[PDB]
Amino acid sequence: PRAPRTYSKTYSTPKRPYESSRLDAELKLAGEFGLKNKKEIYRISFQLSKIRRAARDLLTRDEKDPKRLFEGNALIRRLVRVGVLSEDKKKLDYVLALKVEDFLERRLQTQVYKLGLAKSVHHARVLITQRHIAVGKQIVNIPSFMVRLDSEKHIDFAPTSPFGGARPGRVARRNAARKAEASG
């Protein structure tokens, strides 16, 4: 009776499991971009495959086919709006060409490291999950964000933690109370 909730996965395992080239390359990517899970990498590859299917099954069709025009323009606009694609490569073949590294570099964690609030992507991960960051005027604690470059303009620290003020800290106050009792 309850109308069933749609659900659909967002990743796909490797066809062939143990190939050292694939494994060492994606381990390189995970250990450089600060990941825990081949799942995240597969997820990004799955998104890339989806967007390429749109590109493929659109470029099969002739120009000025209004379906091709509409769907490709919407794909270009949202992809440029998120910034993984450039602002001058709108010919749909770069969309065919795009890379998993581009998707990961558009994520929040490495973005935090580019803005320089981390000194390491792992520091960015703990800063995100401990919420000492907010991309707008609202806190977020998820790495996979895919910022839209307007986000870059609107970055700041967490209002409810130091480096953007308004409170000194939990363990800071703990140590201060400890030393206040100790000096007495």
């Binding site: 109308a3 209004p66 509409f70 323009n73």
Partner: protein, 258 residues
């Protein structure tokens, strides 16, 4: 199933009411009335999901039972009455008059109008016959049954009515070159100025119909609704007036106001 149905689940209620697939596993079944089940907008979904004048079906039932509301000049205090096509509704509070017409996107619109523009409506004749005692009569698209009309009035014509009685103010004949409105199918909401038609004696008379950008199409003569002559509509029409521009112009449109 062993007798008439009384219930209606969601996802068997039609699409164009735009009822949400969450919020309880049941939908409002239109009780019988002067319009069908599907080409009808019940007053519960009207007040609760077009205007937001109420929040809960109890509140909508409260309004309908305390008689702030009235359709076709009558209170009609049933929660699931079919407010169908072309119909008039009058609210003393706020002194509004909603008209029920279609939009080109395939939805029941909300047409704000005045009290005198409410006091007349339009109705397509659905059929003509001879009643008892030799009284010719006709019957419209809104269950209205009218006696002693003009002999000029034949099938597919349209009549404009007083709403204090069921009598006629005037009529409009069917012929080539008249302004219309579509009600039923993929063409729901178009407005398209008859260019010709075709007979096929034995069933399914078809009509060629085009809107003012020259753009033509064809529809069944029982799905169309003639609203008058070219240029002037006999009523006020909602935003867009039945044009069905492309998907890309409307994307660019929204991107222009943002």
């Amino acid at each position: 199933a062993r007798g008439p149905k009384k219930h209606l689940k969601r996802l068997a209620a039609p699409h164009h009411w735009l009822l949400d697939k969450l919020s309880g596993c049941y939908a409002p079944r239109p009780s019988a009335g002067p319009h069908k089940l599907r080409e009808s907008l019940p007053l519960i979904v009207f007040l609760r999901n077009r205007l937001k004048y109420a929040l809960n079906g109890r509140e909508v039932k409260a309004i309908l039972m305390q008689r702030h509301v009235k359709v076709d000049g009558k209170v009609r205090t049933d929660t699931t009455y079919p407010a169908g096509f072309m119909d008039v509704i009058t609210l003393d509070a706020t002194n509004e008059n909603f008209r029920l017409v279609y939009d080109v996107k395939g939805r029941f619109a909300v047409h704000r109008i005045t009290d005198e523009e409410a006091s007349y409506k339009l109705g397509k004749v659905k059929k003509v016959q001879l009643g008892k005692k030799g009284v010719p009569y006709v019957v419209t698209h809104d269950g209205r049954t009218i006696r002693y009309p003009d002999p000029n009035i034949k099938v597919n014509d349209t009549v404009k009515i007083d709403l204090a009685s069921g009598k006629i103010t005037d009529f409009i004949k069917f012929d080539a070159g008249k302004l219309v409105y579509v009600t039923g199918g993929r063409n729901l909401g178009r407005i398209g100025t008859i260019v010709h038609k075709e007979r096929h004696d034995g069933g399914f008379d078809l009509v060629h119909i085009k809107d003012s950008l020259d753009n033509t199409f064809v529809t069944r003569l029982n799905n169309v609704f003639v609203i008058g002559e070219q240029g002037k509509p006999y009523i006020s029409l909602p935003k867009g007036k039945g044009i069905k521009l492309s998907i890309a112009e409307e994307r660019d449109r929204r991107r222009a106001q943002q």
